[PDB]
Copies of this chain bind each other. A is one copy, B any other.
Amino acid sequence: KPGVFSFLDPLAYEIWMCIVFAYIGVSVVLFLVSIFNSLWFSLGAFMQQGCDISPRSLSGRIVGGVWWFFTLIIISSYTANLAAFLTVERMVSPIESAEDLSKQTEIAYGTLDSGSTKEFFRRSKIAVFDKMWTYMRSAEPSVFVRTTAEGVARVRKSKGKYAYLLESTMNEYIEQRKPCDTMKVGGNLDSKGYGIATPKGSSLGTPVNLAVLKLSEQGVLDKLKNKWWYDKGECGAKDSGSKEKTSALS
């Protein structure tokens, strides 16, 4: 984003307020050494280095000297800071806690139009999630989407205008997928766990259970999760992260 507001980025707006006030403060003083021509001549100071219409120093040129050191430090700091923007170019996340989505209104957020999740919010008694539910029900056009693929569509079209909840492992699995535009943020809203299911009274049950815990402690599950996800990943996270060092200028 440009739009002039981008230009003031290196130095904070409050500091601009303070430099304006400090400037006019410099202006009014000049008349005493001699105030409409004081603001004019101060404009003749900012316009070029600083000050002139005094007998050498007297008690006037000193003001412009300090003023010169001052503006010099300002522009210096400005250049340093702007270069600092031109170096790392880190990209801040708009949000952190899921609660922030509730707190704001700028970005729509929703879920799949039907499924256990929607009920989970509809049945949630927590005030935050309740607010989320009244929100999602209230807003139109509906945040709800018929398919997970539809959610992918609204997200890729969102350009940051919209966010979409879904199952965590599925979310990360999309994160591996191209164009790797997607990314998950925040922790899980609630604990859940896929598990092996057996017919009731099946003899296999207990051995299956012991097998599950045994494989789990061997880290085999985590190993395979490393496999089918990240190893199969279309866009390596630190791989794509290592590669981003362009330049030029708008």
Q: Which residues of A contact B (CB under 8 A)?
A: 9-12, 15, 36-41, 43-44, 46-52, 55-58, 61-62, 64-65, 67-69, 72, 75-92, 96-97, 99-100, 103-106, 120, 123-127, 130-131, 134, 138, 187, 190-191, 193, 216-217, 219-223, 226, 231-232, 236, 238-243, 245-250
Contacts and interface: CB of A to CB of B under 8 A. Distances in A.
Nearest to A89: B84
Given A40-B61, A86-B80, A105 B11 contact: no
Nearest to A71: B72
12 contacts: A44-B57, A46-B68, A47-B67, A48-B64, A76-B78, A85-B247, A90-B90, A90-B246, A97-B238, A103-B242, A106-B242, A138-B232
Q: Is the interface of A mostly helix, strand, loop or mixed?
A: helix
User: Can you list the 5 inter-chain pairs with the closest CB atoms, starting with the nearest?
Assistant: A40-B57, A40-B56, A48-B49, A84-B86, A47-B65
Contacts of A72: 75
Contacts of A134: 231
Contacts of A91: 87-88, 245
Contacts of A96: 241
A40 B68 contact: no
A56 B76 contact: no
Contact of A249 (B12, B65, B92, B222): B12
Given A9-B248, A43-B57, A106-B243, A90 B84 contact: yes
Given A15-B249, A106-B243, A68 B84 contact: no
Q: Looking at A51, A62, A84, A250, which has the most chain B CB atoms within 10 Å of its CB?
A: A84
Contacts of A223: 125-126
A68 B86 contact: no
Nearest to A79: B76
Nearest to A46: B65
